[PDB]
Design a protein around this nucleic acid. Sequence first.
DNA 1: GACCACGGCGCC
DNA 2: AAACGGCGCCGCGGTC
Length: 539
Amino acid sequence: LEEAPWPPPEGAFVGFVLSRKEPMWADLLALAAARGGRVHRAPEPYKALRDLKEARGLLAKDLSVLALREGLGLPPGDDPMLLAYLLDPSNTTPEGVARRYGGEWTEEAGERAALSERLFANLWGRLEGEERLLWLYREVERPLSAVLAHMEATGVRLDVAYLRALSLEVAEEIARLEAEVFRLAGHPFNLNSRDQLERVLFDELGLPAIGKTEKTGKRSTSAAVLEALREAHPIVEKILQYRELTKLKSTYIDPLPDLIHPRTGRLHTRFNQTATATGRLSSSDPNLQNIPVRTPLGQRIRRAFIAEEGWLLVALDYSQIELRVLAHLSGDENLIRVFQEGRDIHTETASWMFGVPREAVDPLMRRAAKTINFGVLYGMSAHRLSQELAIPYEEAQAFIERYFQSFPKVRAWIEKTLEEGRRRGYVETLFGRRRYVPDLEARVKSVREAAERMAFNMPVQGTAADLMKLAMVKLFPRLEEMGARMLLQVHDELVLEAPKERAEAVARLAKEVMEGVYPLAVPLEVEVGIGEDWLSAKE
DNA sequence: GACCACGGCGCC
DNA sequence: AAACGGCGCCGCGGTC
Ligand SMILES: Nc1nc2c(ncn2[C@H]2C[C@H](O)[C@@H](COP(=O)(O)OP(=O)(O)OP(=O)(O)O)O2)c(=O)[nH]1
Ligand SMILES: [Mg+2]
Ligand SMILES: [Mg+2]
Ligand SMILES: [Mg+2]
């Protein structure tokens, strides 16, 4: 390319190098652009950012987040990663995408700009004639990238002092548990080491090994194994409490307070747009799609996520979403009827499981019931079900029989999906998002059947993901209009922040947008709550 | 200090 | 653990 002075013309492809992967924490080390057989290298990149009307190129959203951080409204536009990810969602990194579609991801901004240009042309060519994938690019993924950049740049408020205090209390309880464990073992050891614990439980103590680990075949110390051993020895209950507390302390209570950004005073995640096989987003650096919610201590942690003063959180979560999606994709009349009658399948399973009235079903039970309902649907075995339910094998076996007897056209959808995946090599969502599953023809049964479970899950999980993305794209400009903010997506949930005076209106509008995003054979229902913290906002 | 493969486990 | 699926992060043990 011809070396041309900086500034590039309109529509040029950007390249940029960050000092580290996280755009909210990164120093912009270099910036360049490519168009019309020229390359333009920015003499000073922060200043040079001011010249661009959009970020067009590889990882466009990341540059846009750093721009937003610096007070500049630079929206992301075309990104070859999104084209590649729609072609094949195993296209997840610029290293891989470059190698596959015509270059090399280097560490030089000029080379990255030139690469972006050339990759876009090839990938755009691969998508010509792919009308449904192009519809996904233009109507969902490209506009969603802009939404995501705003969400990342906005961040979420965290009660840092509360978490610091919680740490000190949790440390004391951890000590009580670990001391009792060591007393019961007859000696101290590293309780965080599963290899050391294995020897203690199965060798030194008498306890029967329940199962084995996948890759190296050690005697497992998983929570499921330990639950089976609850009655066998008092040390087990202590280990399980220790595990809960140390998990929560090391993953959330301790790290999150140290991640507050000094310019915003907020916590800033990354919403990774080309990271999953099904078309879900992911969240990292810190992952805010797995904040605790289930146990009393987990709930305590979730309360640290709070609204700005003068604002409220609004949390919206699709009701029974993959079951509704399944009703649409399958066309089962009974399943469709269930949702037209306004019934809740999780609550029903929960009521049946724990033998209490529907009004007695608590959140723990509902989560237990979710495991059963999705478990059975996506191919859980009777043996595992026995344990989950804590009933005889023969009864757990019969539960699966009835499930599919009740909803007869699901199995037919499963089988059509699978043969189509064998013939075509891929499966697809309602909108035509594709996942290639080659091991559907594998001759090792365990490998083939694993592949099958991956393959027929994807149209359901992926259609839910497409719906939620679409709703995000539609909703974002309405929030801007009302002075509200989109903060988090958690797969079928959004967390917004709204001024107190407009919070009720924002909740109503966001609920309607999510519910009417793309009408199906059944209604989509959305549960909405408002509160000062994330826990209270889902109450 | 980094990176890893693994087991394990938090959420959806 | 087990014929549920999709993720990312932690600590260990190990390496470089
Ligand atoms: N395969 C599988 N999928 C799950 C599991 N938990 C959640 N999901 C998927 C299916 C859910 O429909 C979707 C959203 O999770 P939610 O916790 O919001 O559950 P759902 O929307 O079904 O119920 P809700 O009415 O919101 O309580 O993510 C699980 O244990 N296994
Ligand atoms: Mg839901
Ligand atoms: Mg949810
Ligand atoms: Mg792993």
